[PDB]
RNA sequence: AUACUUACCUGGCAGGGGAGAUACCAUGAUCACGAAGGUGGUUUUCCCAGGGCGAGGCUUAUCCAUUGCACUCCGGAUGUGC
């Protein structure tokens, strides 16, 4: 609930292949700012989810506000801030601990 | 259909890995203890050829499970090709 560089997206369509999903998330979410990375896995724990990492928290906050509920492959997107900093954010900060 | 008989038409030949090495066994080698080797085994190194076993992995769809906070791939099942 507290703003973050990374947004967490769930309720994604699980049928969509990994590169396609990264691709289509990039298209939609660059409109709000510079993206450092989009992480997708199709494993059991991680399917249906993506982390979009932005350079600025303000882009993240605007991306979260605007896209909340957005129809994406026949499913509304659920978006939150990530609970924890993404490794590349934390290393940028010197906050990083293994 | 099978076996033989006669007539007619036809008709090449040759083979089954190869090459090394073997200290050990057999061949109980005809000259005062002995050949070397060769041959046949055994073991082994090359040239390797066809099979056996299929651990693992690649690919794609049905069903089942999953609403999951990660940043070291990575749920289950079943089937065509690899």
UniProtKB/Swiss-Prot annotation:
Belongs to the RRM U1 A/B'' family. This is U1 small nuclear ribonucleoprotein A. Changing residue 8 to F: Substantially reduces RNA binding. Residues 5-84 form the RRM domain. The chain holds residues 6 to 103 of 282 of the full protein. U1 snRNP is composed of the 7 core Sm proteins SNRPB, SNRPD1, SNRPD2, SNRPD3, SNRPE, SNRPF and SNRPG that assemble in a heptameric protein ring on the Sm site of the small nuclear RNA to form the core snRNP, and at least three U1 snRNP-specific proteins SNRNP70/U1-70K, SNRPA/U1-A and SNRPC/U1-C. Interacts with SFPQ; component of a snRNP-free complex with SFPQ. Interacts with IVNS1ABP (via BACK domain); the interaction is indirect. Component of the spliceosomal U1 snRNP, which is essential for recognition of the pre-mRNA 5' splice-site and the subsequent assembly of the spliceosome. U1 snRNP is the first snRNP to interact with pre-mRNA. This interaction is required for the subsequent binding of U2 snRNP and the U4/U6/U5 tri-snRNP. SNRPA binds stem loop II of U1 snRNA. In a snRNP-free form (SF-A) may be involved in coupled pre-mRNA splicing and polyadenylation process. May bind preferentially to the 5'-UGCAC-3' motif on RNAs. The modification N6-acetyllysine is found at residue 55. It is found in: Nucleus.
